[model samples]
Target chain A: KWVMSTKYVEAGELKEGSYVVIDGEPCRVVEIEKSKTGKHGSAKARIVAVGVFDGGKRTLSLPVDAQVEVPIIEKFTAQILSVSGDVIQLMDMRDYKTIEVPMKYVEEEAKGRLAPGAEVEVWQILDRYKIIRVKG
Target chain B: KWVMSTKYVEAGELKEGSYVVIDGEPCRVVEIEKSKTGKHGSAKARIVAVGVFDGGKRTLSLPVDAQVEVPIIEKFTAQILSVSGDVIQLMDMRDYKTIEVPMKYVEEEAKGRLAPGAEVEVWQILDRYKIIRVKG
Candidate 1:
């Protein structure tokens, strides 16, 4: 069974900095180009997006009126409880639940600065967690 | 249509540092535990792996004798041609082909150090490329 983790949106409504799903991965739209195939053809939208979790680049071209998947992203704060090798233990600030995140899910710039008791921002998408940045 | 980009291997044969596919994503095995469900039960394997591309943590439990998917990984060298915002242009050292990689696919430690003409290691898995490290 598949769970609904994304919502449908009109491609033409998407703008730079919007989020869209490409190849089943959630991505941030970095560039968008709208053009017509021919003089009387329907409008098409070309999107260049970067993966939010995997950091991959993806491109898609489709009718501007076509429906696209936009992932439901959740952002919150957490405090690091411990760092053990490739796993970082965190306590969610909102619900006080503990979560263990792999080091691979952490933003590179925040990796070296992470330590016990440091506050950080977490992005939850498709039931997976990633450390976005270290907070002051 | 599915292309064969992964091979099956006995789970029991997998060791720490091995590569395995969990939930359709290629991951590196970080920790593994083998145990029996009961005195006469078959052996089971508990695997904890980190995603190679997304940096997510995934866990799986299955029979040790069961088959698991192991992604085919390719490693090579490349020279950076340019860095524009979130996209990096690279020239493959072996093929001399130019490719554009999104910044999200680059390793965090290597992100800041990347510049034109820098040599880097690239990991290609399932038709996707990621910058693993910057070479001297």
Candidate 2:
């Protein structure tokens, strides 16, 4: 819904390990490497993003001629317990969840870098495809 | 101008050497770092970005909660001479020059393990202020 898409540049305006929010969700960069196509061909630009899903990492790569938008970070917390393509298991590291959260409202990343017993709280959940807004 | 954006999920997608285009112009990503706040609140997330005008590594911090969309990377062939506060400061690596790119469109930051000659075909960039269209 709300995403950043830009062109590639030899000298980009972004670096690795920087913080950014996508579609209102916060994310971090893990790697930024460069490559070329052929002996005399133009070079390629590349990048990767890491997300805190379930004590694992979410890495995304960029094509040499692609672009992206960086988002603003917000307040929230989470300790990823488990995450898969269709579900997310976590504890309220921020102690913000009321009584409990609905399983349908949460779709987690397969895995991330959070340690076991580490606390986590997702400020805002994205995955509108899995959970409808304000309804079942 | 409505520019397309993209997001990345891996590091291998990057090229070894090449030119990049941001919003259709040539660009690059220079540095990346892993940082945290509040001591106990660490790892938290990874970061990747570069400088704007001064080309001094435009960095920003992310709270625990944030979401950002990837950008659509464009392809171009150019050399990165340097990145300064008020200039992209570009030049052919073969014959370098000190060019001054606009600063207002870029920001500076300090996040992590970066190096000189760090080439990047951008994967991300964001605006301090935003302009979005909401439908009723």
Candidate 3:
């Protein structure tokens, strides 16, 4: 299902916690800097962005008038129904649909702690479901 | 001063190697699946995306006809002019202007290898620069 709509905004208008597509990925603006100005008097925006899903850090500086895309991330919840060697079964919270995902998708730290009926948050990015974090 | 422009396209038209803004992050599609059909007989696009900056994996499922945004990542090379504890000075290859970036913006793994004259690639996202890689 299509769940998110992406919006475009200017670089100068970005603020902390704002989401923008940086380096081709959806990112959250963690900080902003606009100290230097060009010959045309436009201050270049230096933005510190973190990948919303991967937690990687990035910094970009652009003309405040530059256009950037912001995307919406949709996360769904599910419960572990069963676990196989490399595949884990889950039941969606909303539709009660059974879903089977590879164990590789689960976060490394949480993998060993997972058990039947454990709750998890499933993120939908490109029309596929990935268990990004194990909740409870 | 510029390398490429960000392009927007429909989600259904996206293919492997194509970039899309998902959850406000830019991602590269690595795989695609369209097995199940909707009530109207349209197949849902199950896409697996890798974070372009963070390398995080993601799965998204959307209708084939959905709209999506595409972003372009530009990488520029520069010569290291000097290095200090918290800042590094660089000279751009294109405009010959001096650019200063915080040491933290450079990838941690590559920091130890940098020197006064080493060449590095600065990835520009929305006009900010982060040292993504160091080259000899």
Candidate 4:
């Protein structure tokens, strides 16, 4: 829906659940692995992420000192109006704008909490959106 | 533009000159600083980046073991047909597809080398593209 700003971060400093862009699409970190430093070079990190909109999995490997991007995600509150098989209809509280989100894109902890009339936190990136938290 | 399969990476493993998504936008790293580990936590890293297309600057800090994302940038060969101020007309060598790029987005080394009939490397990210290397 919208984007705010961005920051640079070290590859070793990225954590799970962080918002990052992979393969030209915005994604969220799902898992990470960091290796100890070697005498010849810096440490290494392995990352795994899931696509925010496409629901695909991605991975990367880099040195600990590598400079990487950290995307700033916008969190908006929405009221769930209906729940279908995989999609949830939501209305933005600010302007009452209605939006659709896939249950598959919802974070693990918030997936089962989707119910009609429930309030949820929608993370917006570019023109895509996903539910990340449930506040029911 | 083509996309590469994404993989996981540690936050500290990121190196400068690599592309990452920050705040839903693609950015290039400009600077980085690392801190030693403390009694309570892992090493911390601070990063600075500039927007690739929008020319914005952002920074982030995180622990060395944190997970992050790395983007796969697509590179193509193109032949410059003409230059008009900030815009340049090019023909893709791979398929002869005609496209245009902004000189402002071209890397510093390629800025003064956008002469007619010169060969260059075009970097593509989603729908946005820029000239990054000149083979003149």
Candidate 5:
């Protein structure tokens, strides 16, 4: 995934349905429009994104000359250590600080990924953690 | 180098003078202490940070349950593409939205490398991008 890495949207590099990863979560990339609205300084990126449950597709306006990251994947089976409000908590055997994520972020299959006795190593990215069941 | 993943006065995986990343820049872990007052719920870790143009030391409280990524030896930089107003903007050549970051939260360099003219990487935990003379 190419992070739109320019203040000026390049000539060709715009598509929808395509996606990128952020904080280890898969983000469906919708639209990317770049423009110059000011005379002396105005480089901007307007984008629409849909991730887990947050973005039922929302727009993010970014400044030109900015930096961003692609999702790097990790695999693990952790427990649903706790749950508070609308958030689910888990811990990666590899990292510290039990992950506090939105409950809506996990799917039905992924929900099963949290059985305390069940080992699940899902695809993970930074703050984003996915489910990969290790047992039948 | 480490990026300023976020500001913290409590809860970090560090002691005193242990290295941590912030805003893609490196800073020494100046001090650490326990919190006496419970703001949100519990008594967590409080930290004192000192860096260039920063406090010789300052304290911040952190939630005991928050994820704090502090390596034994990490590099962090406040490598800013363009910082305007209250929110500092960044790029992560990885995702689209959410890459625009704050100087306070960006921490430690993800992968130790860069291209001066390449795209600036944004977002720390999930979506991120970077600049390089030649594409990686």
Candidate 6:
């Protein structure tokens, strides 16, 4: 079950929508500004990113040539097996393997509508899974 | 602005939907079970909760008499002031104060629909804010 969760990339290579790890959290770059610092000039990059799961704001200021970590995110479809207390058991649509996720990971509006046999979209990152939405 | 962020409560007092702090994250209780530990036993509690912001599952097992921390969560309405690269500036509907949040906090479906002057629902906990949805 072990897999490489992150890879190194140059800060200058990051673009809007790029995936990067900031403050040890997986995030997606939303903005990147490049500039030169002081008299003894060195290229600098200011990147703004949002937590992929936590939705927290994260910013990084570093040399454009500096290396940063980028996380690998995966998305899959699953079928609901059961809706227990605060957990939902699911079977992967592709692999048919069982998976479990907390109800809190489900979108608030879709929480009340989820039921057994429902198809949903799930995102997996750093070995964790979250139900993003119910499939139509 | 300093304010009370958490409160202590008996583990046995928690109910479904109760807010709790688990593993240092603010979460909502999804299920709780109380049982006797042994023959010469004391009551024990097992709680399952999901993070309010990160949507991660968390579990706790402790004596029923033990105390646990619960976070104070706040929700408010805000209007979009501007949509910048990876951030959105908003003005609180009630206080009329300006607030800024990362775009990742907005629901995926509502992200493209958001625009300046649009209304949004914001959730605040532990001095952090997330835009949960765009208002109709």
**What DockQ do the predictions score, one after another?**
0.02, 0.02, 0.03, 0.01, 0.04, 0.02
Instruction: Quote the positional error of residue A64 for candidate 6 in Å.
Output: 1.1
lDDT of 3 by residue, A18-108 (tens): 9877656677789997755335455666788877556678776555776677775668899999998899899999999998888766767
Error of 6 at B70 (Å): 30
TM-score of structure candidate 1: 0.49
How does candidate 5 fare on TM-score? 0.28
lDDT of 5 by residue, B1-136 (tens): 7744454332546777665545544346677776646455676776666642232454556765565545333222333333322233443344433334433442335223222223443322223322211222
Model 4 Cα lDDT, one tens digit per residue, A13-87: 888978777777677899999887677778898889977777789888888778777666778899876554446
Q: Supply every candidate's count of residue pairs whose N, Cα or C atoms clash at under 3 angstroms.
A: 1, 114, 18, 39, 88, 0
Which 10 residues in a row give candidate 3 chain B its minimum summed lDDT? B80-89
| Model number with the top TM-score | 1
Please state how well chain A of candidate 1 matches the true chain A, as a TM-score. 0.91
- Model 6: clashing residue pairs? none
Predicted complex 1: DockQ: 0.02
Instruction: Answer with 1 or 6, whichever has the higher TM-score.
Output: 1
Fnat of candidate 5, please?
Answer: 0.04
lDDT tens readout by residue for model 4, B44-117: 66667887877888665555565555656778899999999878899999999999887787888788877999
Off by over 4 Å in 5: A1-26, A34-44, A52-58, A63-66, A75-104, A108-121, A132-136, B1-136
* Poorly placed runs, candidate 2 (over 4 Å): A1-11, A19-27, A37-43, A54-65, A69-72, A77-122, A125-136, B1-136
- The residue ranges of model 6 lying beyond 4 angstroms of the native Cα positions read A107-113, B1-136
Deviation (Å) of B43 in candidate 5: 48
Candidate 2 per-residue lDDT, tens place, B93-123, comes to 3345433333343323321211123342322
Local error of candidate 4 at B87, Å?
2.2
lDDT of each: 0.87, 0.37, 0.76, 0.76, 0.48, 0.81
Per-prediction interface RMSD in Å: 10.6, 11.8, 9.1, 15.9, 8.4, 9.9
lDDT of 5 at B92: 37
Best by lDDT: 1
Q: Is candidate 4 or candidate 6 better by lDDT?
A: 6
